[PDB]
């Protein structure tokens, strides 16, 4: 069975763990599907091919309202295709940051759905291991919408260190996953971390960079000693303690977390400080991601323009080429789709300059949206202290970004506007 013989790509949906996610359409029935394309050369398999096929077959037969539905699985010489259901409500935290009010009832309603999904998958001997906010999608971008857990079962078969992929993962990993011996209790720990963030807006294990967060997770010590925890019930704190128990055999099960008094009481007072902190948290994570994407896209577009100029030169020394511009794009890469991308751009040098400038403007606009969102007081600038947090999350060395900051503007007074921030990212990816 061949994937392209059944589905056609419509548009990109986002970046997933182990691969890119494309919105596809069945060529006969018109059914829309989310397809994750895992490149075999950039991921690698940690199990035998027979074990993967067995897990996929089991996953296709499972059904729970809080677990993503997997429909199909294809494989060719260079890729794996995971075909499943489209959830259009966005990421859970992106919905929570838009709310004006959030309470323990809102938090418990969320955590009951995650724990229901997890309890079901653990009965079927499936472990997630990489449970995190990004893997919690909503069916609708609204309150009380159903939460679907994505990627439950892939970690056991695919190998995860590309920085843009690792960002936002160290907060949630169970300490025993770091040391190598782990079972289904690691999913309770990650849910405990998510619950701690929902009620305080701050991760229980934090640090200036990836390794500093992992050190805190490995020691496993945390506290409820922040002013915002004074406005939270002891029952919520008691559940978090059972969920963040260090020794996995002593940690509460997902089933026993659903039967905890906190879940049963609060799923039958606004946490204003928690909403303020979670916005700052999401903004920081999203600006670090956007910054790494921008740098990655600048190297990709620099490499592609060098490869594209060689293909278009060899095909000519007149210096001019409609039909040959189409053939050259397909050499680097639907004939109707390719024709339309070149018609939008409309001498091959001027065409290459217009097609590149169009990609550069769109790359600048995605980064700018994330910068604007991070700048919640609309000051137009981000401080040196905020740059340290952003570059810490994105794993850019301190002496390196401070040197680059000095080279962009010698008279920065510990702040950068958007244009200066963008200039610094260009210097950090060899431009």
Ligand X SMILES: Nc1nc(-c2ccc(F)c(Cl)c2)c(-c2ccc3ncccc3n2)s1
Minimal distance, residue 232 CB to ligand X, in Å: 30
Residue 379 counted as an annotated binding residue: yes
Q: Say which residue the tokens 């401080």 belong to.
A: 383
- Residue 316 marked ligand-binding: yes
Q: Is 386 annotated as a binding residue?
A: yes
Residues facing residue 67 across a β-bridge: 149
DSSP of 150-213: --TTTTTTB----STTTTT-TTT--HHHHHT---TTHHHHHHHHHHHHHHHSS-SS--SSHHHH
Q: How far is the CB of 1 from ligand X (least distance, A)?
A: 16
Instruction: Write down the least CB distance from residue 161 to ligand X, Å.
Output: 17
What secondary structure letter does DSSP report for 62? -
CB of 340 to ligand X, least distance (A): 24
Q: Is 350 annotated as a binding residue?
A: yes
Catalytic residues: 130
The two structure tokens encoding residue 3: 């994937």
Are 81 and 2 spatial neighbours (Cβ–Cβ below 8 Å)? no
Environment class of 29 (CB within 10 Å of its CB; exposed 0-12, middle 13-18, buried 19+): exposed
305-to-302, 346, 425 alpha-carbon distances in Å = 5, 17, 20
* CA count, 13 A, side-chain hemisphere, 73: 14
* Beta carbon of residue 252, minimum distance to ligand X (angstroms, whole number): 27
- CA dist 111 and 192 (Å) reads 9
Residue 411 annotated as binding site: yes
| Distance set, CA 214 to CA 168, 209, 219, 248, 321 (Å) | 12, 9, 9, 17, 55
- Helix or strand run (H / E) with residue 19: strand 19-26
Q: Which residues partner with 25 through β-bridges?
A: 8, 32
Closest CA relative to residue 288, chosen from 385, 396, 194, 399 = 396
Residues 6+ apart with CB under 8 A from 35: 3, 7, 9, 21, 22, 23, 24, 81, 82, 83, 84
Q: Which is nearer to ligand X, 139 or 420 (CB)?
A: 139
Contact 204, 217 (CB under 8 A): no
Q: Which residue has the tokens 């670090």?
A: 288
- Flag whether 26 is marked binding: no
- Is the Cβ of residue 85 or residue 409 nearer to ligand X in the bound state? 85
Compare residues 37 and 405 and give the one whose CB is closer to ligand X: 37
CB of 3 to ligand X, least distance (A): 12
Provide, rounded to whole angstroms, the least separation between the CB of residue 42 and ligand X. Answer: 15
Answer yes or no: is 420 a known binding residue. Answer: yes
In the bound complex, which residue of the shown chain has the CB atom lying closest to ligand X? 16
Establish whether 36 is an annotated binding residue.
yes
User: 356 Cβ partners below 8 Å, 6+ apart?
Assistant: 301, 305
Three-state secondary structure call for residue 244: coil
Q: Is 407 annotated as a binding residue?
A: no
> Is 377 within any annotated ligand binding site?
yes
The nearer residue to ligand X, 122 or 157, going by C-beta atoms, is 157
| DSSP state, residue 220 | T
Binding site for ligand X (CB under 6 A): 13-14, 16-17, 21, 34, 36, 70, 82-84, 86-88, 137, 150-151
Output the smallest distance, CB 122 to ligand X, in A: 18
- Tell me whether residue 169 or residue 301 sits nearer to ligand X (CB atom): 169
Q: Are 26 and 16 in contact (CB under 8 A)?
A: no
Cα distance between residue 337 and residue 245, in whole Å = 53
Q: Residues forming the annotated binding site? A: 36, 316, 318, 320, 324, 346-347, 350, 375, 377, 379, 381, 386, 409, 411, 413, 415, 420
Which residues participate in the annotated binding site for Ca(2+)? 316, 318, 320, 324, 346-347, 350, 375, 377, 379, 381, 386, 409, 411, 413, 415, 420
């Amino acid at each position: 069975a061949i994937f392209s013989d059944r589905y056609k790509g419509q548009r990109v949906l986002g970046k997933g763990s182990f691969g890119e996610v494309i919105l596809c359409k069945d060529k006969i029935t018109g059914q829309e599907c989310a397809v994750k394309v895992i490149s075999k050369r950039q991921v690698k398999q940690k199990t035998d091919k027979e074990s993967l096929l067995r897990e996929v077959q089991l996953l296709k037969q499972l059904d729970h309202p809080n677990i993503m539905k997997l429909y199909e699985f294809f494989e060719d010489k260079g890729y794996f295709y995971l075909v499943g259901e489209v959830y259009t409500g966005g990421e859970l935290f992106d919905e929570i940051i838009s709310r004006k009010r959030f309470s323990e009832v809102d938090a418990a309603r969320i955590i009951r759905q995650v724990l229901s999904g997890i309890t079901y998958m653990h009965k079927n001997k499936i472990v997630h291991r990489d449970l995190k906010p990004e893997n919690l999608l909503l069916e609708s971008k609204s309150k009380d919408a159903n939460i679907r857990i994505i990627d439950f079962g892939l970690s056991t078969h695919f190998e995860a260190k590309k920085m843009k992929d690792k960002i936002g993962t160290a907060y949630y990993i169970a300490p025993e996953v770091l040391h190598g011996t782990y079972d289904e209790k690691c999913d309770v720990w990650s849910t405990g971390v998510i619950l701690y963030i929902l009620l305080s807006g701050c991760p229980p294990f934090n640090g200036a960079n990836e390794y500093d967060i992992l050190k805190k997770v490995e020691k496993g010590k945390y506290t409820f000693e922040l002013p915002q925890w004074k406005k939270v019930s002891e029952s919520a704190k008691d559940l978090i303690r059972k969920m963040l128990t260090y020794v996995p055999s002593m940690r509460i099960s997902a089933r026993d977390a659903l039967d905890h008094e906190w879940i049963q009481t609060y799923t039958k007072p606004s946490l204003d400080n928690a909403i303020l902190n979670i916005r700052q948290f999401q903004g920081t994570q999203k600006l670090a991601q956007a910054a790494l994407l921008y740098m990655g896209s600048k190297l990709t577009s620099q490499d592609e323009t060098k490869e594209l100029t060689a293909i278009f030169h060899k095909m000519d020394g007149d210096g001019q080429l409609r039909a040959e511009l189409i053939e050259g794009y397909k050499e680097l890469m639907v004939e109707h789709e390719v024709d339309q991308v070149l018609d939008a751009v409309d001498e091959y040098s001027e065409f290459v300059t217009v097609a590149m400038d169009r990609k550069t403007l769109l790359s600048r606009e995605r980064l700018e949206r994330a910068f604007r969102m991070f700048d919640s007081d609309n000051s137009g600038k981000i401080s040196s202290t905020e740059l340290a947090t952003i570059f810490g999350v994105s794993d850019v060395d301190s002496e390196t970004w401070k040197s680059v900051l000095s080279e962009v503007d010698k008279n920065n007074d510990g702040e950068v506007d958007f244009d200066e921030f963008q200039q610094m990212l260009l210097k950090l990816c060899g431009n």
